[PDB]
Amino acid sequence: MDIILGIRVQDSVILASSKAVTRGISVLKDSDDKTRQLSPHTLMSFAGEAGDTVQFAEYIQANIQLYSIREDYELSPQAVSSFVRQELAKSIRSRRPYQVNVLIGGYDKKKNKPELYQIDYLGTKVELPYGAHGYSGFYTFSLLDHHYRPDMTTEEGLDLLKLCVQELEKRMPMDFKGVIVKIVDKDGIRQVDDF
Amino acid sequence: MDIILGIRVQDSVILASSKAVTRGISVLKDSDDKTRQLSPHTLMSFAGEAGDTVQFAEYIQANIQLYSIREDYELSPQAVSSFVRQELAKSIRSRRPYQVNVLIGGYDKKKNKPELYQIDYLGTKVELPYGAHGYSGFYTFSLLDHHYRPDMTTEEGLDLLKLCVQELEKRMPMDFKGVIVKIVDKDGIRQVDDF
Amino acid sequence: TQQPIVTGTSVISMKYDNGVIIAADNLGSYGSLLRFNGVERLIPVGDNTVVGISGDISDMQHIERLLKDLVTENAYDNPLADAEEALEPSYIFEYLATVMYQRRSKMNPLWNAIIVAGVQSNGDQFLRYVNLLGVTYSSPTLATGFGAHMANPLLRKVVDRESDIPKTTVQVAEEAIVNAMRVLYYRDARSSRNFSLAIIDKNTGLTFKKNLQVENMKWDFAKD
Amino acid sequence: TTTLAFRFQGGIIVAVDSRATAGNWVASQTVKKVIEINPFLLGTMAGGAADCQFWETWLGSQCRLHELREKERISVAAASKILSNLVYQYKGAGLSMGTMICGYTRKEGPTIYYVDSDGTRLKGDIFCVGSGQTFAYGVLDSNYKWDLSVEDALYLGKRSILAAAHRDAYSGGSVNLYHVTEDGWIYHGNHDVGELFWKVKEEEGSFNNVIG
Amino acid sequence: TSIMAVTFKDGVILGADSRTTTGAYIANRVTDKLTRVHDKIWCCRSGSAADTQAIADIVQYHLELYTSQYGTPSTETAASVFKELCYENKDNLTAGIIVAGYDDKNKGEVYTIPLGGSVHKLPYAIAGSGSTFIYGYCDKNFRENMSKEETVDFIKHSLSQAIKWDGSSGGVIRMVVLTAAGVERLIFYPDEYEQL
Amino acid sequence: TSIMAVTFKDGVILGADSRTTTGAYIANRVTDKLTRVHDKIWCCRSGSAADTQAIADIVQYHLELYTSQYGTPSTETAASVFKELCYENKDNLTAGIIVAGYDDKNKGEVYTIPLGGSVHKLPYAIAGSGSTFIYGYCDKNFRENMSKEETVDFIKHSLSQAIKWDGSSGGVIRMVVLTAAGVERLIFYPDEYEQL
Amino acid sequence: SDPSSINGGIVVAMTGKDCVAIACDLRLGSQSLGVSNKFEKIFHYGHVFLGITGLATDVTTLNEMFRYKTNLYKLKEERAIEPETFTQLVSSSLYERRFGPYFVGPVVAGINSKSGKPFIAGFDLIGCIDEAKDFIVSGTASDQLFGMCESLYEPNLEPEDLFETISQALLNAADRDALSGWGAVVYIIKKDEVVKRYLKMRQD
Amino acid sequence: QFNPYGDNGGTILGIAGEDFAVLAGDTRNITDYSINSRYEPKVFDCGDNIVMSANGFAADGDALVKRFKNSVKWYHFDHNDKKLSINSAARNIQHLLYGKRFFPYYVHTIIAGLDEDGKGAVYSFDPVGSYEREQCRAGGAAASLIMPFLDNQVNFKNQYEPGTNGKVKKPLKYLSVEEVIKLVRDSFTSATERHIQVGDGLEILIVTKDGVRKEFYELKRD
Amino acid sequence: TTIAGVVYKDGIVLGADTRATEGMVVADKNCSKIHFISPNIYCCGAGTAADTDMTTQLISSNLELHSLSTGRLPRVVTANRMLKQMLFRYQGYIGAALVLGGVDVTGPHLYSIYPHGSTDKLPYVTMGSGSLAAMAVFEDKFRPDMEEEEAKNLVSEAIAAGIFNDLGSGGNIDLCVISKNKLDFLRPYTVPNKKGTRLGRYRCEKGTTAVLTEKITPL
C-alpha cells in the first residue's frame, strides 16, 4: 500500500490514507480503506506488504477489543501505540517479519489531547505533530514544516492536508486514486465523505 | 517514457502520447511532447530509455529533413518507416543499442491513404490499423478490437481514443498526466489542443 | 549433501541360461590418486546373492554392514533361516532400494550405484540396479558408471534381448564379462588390472573368484 | 488464463477461459477454472493449477463443515476468509493463487471477494484475474453499468473473455459462463472460441484487425 | 601425465608415459609425448595438448629457421624460445614443458619450464600430474654421471611408480636417448615395468 | 603434515613431523601429532587440528570406558570408534587419521581412516599433505617383517623426503614404537635427517 | 529473453509429385501479447521460396538481405537463382555471423527449373543444412510439426492431396502452441503455377 | 551439490473409448544418452480395474505407483472390500501428489479405467496434483509430437466435411478398441522415428468390463 | 553421432552414422557426416554440425588451391595442420571434432582432431556421443594390418555399437574406404533398422481444410 499521512491539530487527529490497491500492472481497487478502528477514540492507518498489512491491523484490532471487554475500559492512545510497537519489535526478529508501517491517531479522553504516533515495521515509535510513511514524507514534511501551527482548527488541518495531497498528486509518479480522510476527536471517529 | 498510442482511421492517423516525464520519485514535467515531425505528412511518436528517445528521434528527423532538401521531395511513410527500422535493426547489435520504441503515423499523398507503422527497439516493424508500445496495448487493444472500424471518421477516431485513455487512467498504476493528441491527414499535422 | 571421496568404478553383470555373473575391480581411487589396491566391492549375502557396489567406499562399507546385519536379523527366531526362509536376492534388493530412495528423499544420499545379482528360490535369474537417487531398473546386462558406456555394448552383443538368455552358456557369459573388464582397463582411467568375479548358478551355486587379472593385452601397435 | 466476475442489477456474472499452459506448451483447452462450492458459492482459479484446484476443493469441505456445525449457509465473507487466512499461513513458500469467491446469501446479498496467494483479500464489484486480466478489464470496464440486463451481462462477460482469449497467448480454448442470483448459480454453457470468435465477428462487426 | 628428462655421462634421456585422458575416459592410450624440435633437441610435454602441440610446432619452426641462418642452435637457445612463448602468453596457455638436448660442447642439458614461464636448468627434471608421487624416489635415487643402462633403469623405475599411483598417467613408457652416437627410441610395456 | 604407521616383526611404529602452519606462518614448530588413545593404541593426526584433537579426546574416553567394563580393546575396536565418529560426522569434519596399535594376539596393526570415513587395514600407511611426495619411495622400499632398526630407518628416510618437499611439513621427526617390550618415544632433529 | 521465442511462429515445407508446398502462421507477438495477425514468414526470390521463423527483426533483415543478394545474382548470372544454389547462399550468409548469429530458422522450398526436381531444405541459426526429401519444419511449434508431419506425410502426393497434408500439419501443430497461429498461409508450388491459400483457423 | 531429481525419459499415452480405455507406454528407460533397459515396464495394473503410469523421474514414479497400489489395498481394508472407483482413485492421487507440494514427485501421472456408468475414463495429473478427466492424453518426452496428431485424428480438429468448405465440422464418431490401438501404435512409431528417447518396445494395457489385457509390440532400437 | 576410422593393411576405412539431431528431436535420419577434403582424403565430422561442415569445406577449398599450385596430391599432414592451426586459433569456439583419414605418397594416415586444436595420430579412433560404444568394439577386436573386408566389418560393427547403444547416434552406416588403388564411398553401407511401417492412412480427403481465399499466378 502507498500513501498514509497524519496530522495532529488543536483538538483532533486527522489521518489521510490512499484508496488505490495495485497488484502489478493493474489497479484492482480505487476505494480501499487502509485503516482499522482499534477503540472508539483510537484509529490506526497502515501500509506495507500485501496481506501482512490487513492481517496485522485486524490482529491488533482484535487484541485491543479484547482488552476493552475484559477491563470495561478504553486504553490510552499512548498505551495502544506501545502495545503495537512491541508487537512489531517482536516481529522484526521472527522467522517471517510483518512488513507493515502504521500511524496511530488517537484522542486521549483523560488528558483531553489529540495524539499521533508513527511506528515503522522495525518497531520505531515516535510521537509527532504530523507524520507519514514511505515516500509521502519526502514531499509533505516540508509543507507541514512551513504551514503547521499547534493551535490549528480541524478545518485548517483539513485545508493543510488538501495542500499535502495536491502536492503528492502533482509530483508522485503513481496514481494513488485519492485519499480517504478520517478525524479522531473527543466525540470519536468520523469519515470526511467529500475530499 | 510511458504510453504511446496510434490509430489509423478512414482519412487520417491519430497519435496519442503521454505528457509525464518522471525520473525516480519525482514527476519532472507534465507537458512533454513525445513526438517529432519527420516531414510535413509524417509524424513519429517515441518511448523508451531516457536520453536515447529524443537523441534517436532528432537524429531520424535530421536525416529525413536532409533527404527532403536533397531531392525536393517527401518520402512516403512506408519509406520513412523502412529507414527507421533499419536504423534500429543496426542499433540492436551495437556496443550500446538505442532503447527506443516508435510509432510512425503518416499520410501517403500518392496513395491518398493514412498509414500507421509500429516499430520496437529491435527493429520489429508492423503496419497496423491501431498500435501501442509497452503496457498500454495490454489494456487498449481489446477496446480497439471491439470498437474499431476501418471506415471511421476522425471524430469517431478521437472518441475511440478517449475511451482508450479513460481505461488507461482507470487501470494503470502510474499517473501519466494525460496525453497530447496529434492528427496526420492530407493537410498535414495538427495538434488537438483540448483533450 | 556430501561429495564422494574414496571411490569405486564400474560394476558389470549379465544373465545367462542358468544364472547370473557379476564383476568389479579391486580399486579404491582417491580422486586421480590410485590409493587403495585391495578393495573388495562384490559382497555376497548368503549362498544365492552377490551385491556389487560402485561409488563412495565409506558408504559402501556402511551398506556392507547393513547387509551383514540383515543376515543376523533374518536368522532370529527363524528355524528355516538356511532353507525356505533364507534371504532372497529380491528381498535384499528391495531393502537396499527402500534405503537408497529414503536417503535421497532426506537430501542425504548413500553415494553409490548398486547391482544386486542372484538366483531366486524357483531358479529364476535376478539382476537389478539401484543408485543414489533410488532409480531402479532391470536388463539382461547391467553396468554402473563407466561400464554402462563400454561394457553394456559388448555384453548386449551376447544377450541383446530376453530370448537370448537360454541360448547363453556360463562359459560364453564369463568370457564376455572378462573381455569387458579388459576393455574397461584399457579405457577407464580410474580402474585396475586386478578384479573379482562372481557366478551365481541355480545348479552349481555361488562361485566367488578373487585376484583375477586382465591379460592378453594388445600394446604392440604403440611402438609405431 | 482469464477469469472475471462482476456484480450488477440482476446478480453476479462469472466467466472464465479454459486453457492450461506449461510455458508455451498448450497442455489443455478443456480445463475447468470454476469450482462449484455449493448451490450459492463459486470459486474462480488463476495462477497455479494445482494450488487452486486443491485449496478451493478443500475450501468446499470447510464450507460444508461450517453449515453442519452451524445449521446455516456459510457467508461469502467467511468462506473467502477461510481461504485467505490459509494462504497467508503458507506465505513465502511459493503458492501461486489468484482467485475470486463469488456467491449470494440473504445477509450480504450478491458478493465477490478477490483472494490471492500473497495474502490480499478484497471485496468489490468487478474483478479480472489471470494473464489476460488487462484485456478483459478493457472491454468490461467500457461497457459496464449497473443498469445491464441478464442477457447483456451474460454476453458482456462472454465477450470480455473472448477479447482476452484473442490477445493473450496463454488464454483461450472455450468460455465457461455462470450467472449467480438470489436462488443460486446457473450454468450458461461452454462456448468454444473456435466458433464463438467467427460468430461474434460476423454478428457484432468487430475484430477488424483480423483476416476473415 | 608423467614426464622426465635426466642427464647422464654420455648425454641425456627423455622419458614419458602414453596416457591422454578426457576426464576419466582414456582418449589416447598410446600418446607420443616426447616431441622433436631439432635433431638432438627434444621436449617432454604436459598440460593442454592443444597448447603444447601448438608451442612445439612454433618452436620447431623457429629452430628450423635459426638453423638455416646460424647453424645448429644450443639446447639453451631452444629453451629460451619455449620460454619466450610460454612467458609472454602465460594468461592463455597451460603448458609445462621439459626441454632436453645434446650438444658436443655442452653434452647433455635439461631445462624445465613450469606454468609461470620461468626457466630452470637442472641435472634432471620431473613434471606432469604423476611427478608429485616420485619427488621422494627421484631425489633419493638420482646420481650424476650415471651410465646409459643406469639412467634407463632410473627413468623406468620412476615413471613406473608415477604410473602406478597417478590415474592420469599410464600405458607404455616411451624414452628417447640423446648422445653423440645419435637418437635412440625405446619403449617399455606394462608387463615389463609393473613387475619392478 | 607428514604422518605414517608401519608394522614390523616385533610390532608397529608410528611416525610424524612437528609442523603446524596457519597459511605460511609456522604457528607451532614442535607439534606432537602422535597422540595416545590407549596404552598401546596410538594415532597419527592430519587435517583440522581442532577436529582431530576433539576426536582423539572422544576416542580416549570411549576406550577408557570400554577398558573399565570389558578389558583392553583391540586395535580394530579403536579404529571402529574413530571410523564411527569420522563417518557419521563427515559433513562437519576434516580429519585424516591413521590408527596403530599392539596386541599380543594380533601383534602390530595399522588402520587408515581418510576423509570419507572409510576404514582400510594395511601393512603400513602414509597420510597428510607431505605423503603425496613419498608414495613412490615408500612402495619401493617397504618390506614386511622388518627389524626395529630397519623400520626406524624406513620411517626416518620417508618423512625426511616428505619434509624436504612439503612446506606444510617440517621440524623434528617424532616416532612412537609399540611392541611387547612397551612404549618407546624417539625424536630425530633436522641436522640428523636432512643429511640422509 | 530467449530470442528465438519472443515473437513466435512457425514454417513447414513438404515435397510432392512434381510439386512442393511451404506454409506458415501469421502471428507476431511480444511474448504473451499478440501484436500482428498479418506477419507473413514466407518470401520469394524468383521461383525459390524462403520461409523464416524466429526473431522478427532478423526475419525482416534476412528477407531484405536475400532480396538484395538474389537481385545482384540475377543481374550478373542473367538467370534466376535455383533452390540448390540459394540453399548454399543462405548457409554461407548465416555462418558468416557464426559468433553473433541471426536468431532464425530458415526453410528453402522450390522446384529446380531445369531438372524439374522438387527441392526443400532447412537450417539452424548458424547455417548447418538439413537436407531432407520428405519435410522441413521450423519455429516455436517445431516439435509439434515434426509429430504431425511424421504421421500424416507420405511421398509423391498430388498438389491438392499435399495441400490437405501440410495444412492439417500446420493447423493442428499451431493450436498446441501459445505463440503460433492467428491465421495461416499455404503456398502450393508447381513448375509453372503457384497457388497461395489463406487458411481459416481459431483466433486464440 | 546433490540433485535429488533425474530424468529417465519415456513416453506414455492414455485414450478413453466409449466402453473401454487404454494406457500405453514405451518400455525404454534411459539416463542422458545411455539406455538403462530396453524392457522396463512403466504402465501398471493397480487392481480394481485401474491402470496407472507415473512417467518422468522413474524413482518418484515407482514411489508414487507403489503408494497408490497400497492406497487401494487399505481402501479395501477400511471400507469393506469396496471397489475404488476411477474418480475416487483420481482424487486420492491428487492428495498423494499435493502431499509433496514443496518437494514434488517429478512425474506426469496418468490413470485409465472405467467410470461407474461403465464408460471409458482417463485422468491426467501434473506433478503437484492438479488433475482432470480427459478423453485423450500423451505424457513425457514425445508428448508434443503425439498430442497434435491425437487432436486431429481422435477429436477431428481442423477437419471439415468435403464440399461445405469450413461450414460443417466432421462429426465426432466413436472409435473401436482396434481403431484406438492402431492410433496408439502409429503414434509411438512416429514418436520413435523422431525422438531419441523413444524406442525398444511398446506395452499397451487395455481396460474393459472383462478386466485388464496386455499387448506388446517391438519398437525401433536405435 | 558415432564416427570412427581404422588403418588397415592397404589403407584407411572411415565410418559414420546418419542421425542429425536438434536436442532430443531427429531432424534428418539420413544425413552425410563423411566429408570430402581432397580426392585421397576424407573427414568424418562430429560436434557442432555447421562448424564441422564449414571447417572441412574451407580446408578442402584451400587444399584444392594448394594442390593446383603444387601440381601434386595433397597430404594428410597438411589437411591436419590447416584444420589444427585454425581450430587452435579459435580456442575451442569452433566446435568441430573430426576424424581425418587419407592416403598419401607417404602411405595411409589417420588423425583425430579436437575443437581446441589438439590432434592425435592413431591406427584407430572414435568420436562423437557414441565414441565409447564404438571404442569398445575396437578394443575388443582391432588388430594391425587387417585385410579390407575385415576392416570394413570392424568399423561397421563399431558404428553399429554406437547406433544401438547411444541415443545421439542412429540411422544408417556410411563407410569410406581409401587405398592407393581406389576410393570407395559406400552410402549406405548397411541399413541396420527398417523404417517403421504405419498401419493406418491418416491423410485427409480433398476439401477437408477450411480455406478463406485463393490466388493463382503463372510463371
Ligand SMILES: *[C@@H](CS(C)(=O)=O)[C@H](Cc1ccc(CN)cc1)NC(=O)[C@@H](NC(=O)[C@H](CC(C)C)NC(=O)[C@@H](Cc1ccccc1)N=[N+]=[N-])[C@@H](C)O
Ligand atoms: C492460467 C493461469 S496464468 C497463465 O498464470 O495467468 C491457468 C489457470 C488454471 C486454473 C485452474 C486449472 C485447473 N486444472 C488449470 C489452469 N494456469 C496454468 O496454466 C498454470 N499451469 C500449471 O500449473 C501447469 C498445469 C499443467 C496441467 C499444464 N503445470 C505447471 O506449470 C508445472 C508444475 C510443476 C510443478 C512442480 C515441478 C515442475 C512443474 N508443470 N508441468 N509439467 C500456469 C502456471 O501456467
Ligand SMILES: *[C@@H](CS(C)(=O)=O)[C@H](Cc1ccc(CN)cc1)NC(=O)[C@@H](NC(=O)[C@H](CC(C)C)NC(=O)[C@@H](Cc1ccccc1)N=[N+]=[N-])[C@@H](C)O
Ligand atoms: C552428431 C554430433 S554429437 C552430439 O557429438 O553426437 C552430429 C554430427 C553431425 C555432423 C554433421 C552433420 C551434418 N553436416 C550432422 C551431424 N551433430 C549434431 O547432430 C549436432 N546438431 C546440430 O548441430 C544441429 C544441426 C541441425 C541442422 C539439426 N543444430 C543444433 O542442434 C543447434 C545448432 C547450434 C549448435 C551449436 C551452438 C548453437 C546452435 N540448433 N539449432 N537450431 C549436435 C550439436 O547435436
Ligand SMILES: [Mg+2]
Ligand atoms: Mg491468444
Ligand SMILES: [Mg+2]
Ligand atoms: Mg595408472
Ligand SMILES: [Mg+2]
Ligand atoms: Mg495457438
Ligand SMILES: [Mg+2]
Ligand atoms: Mg528413437
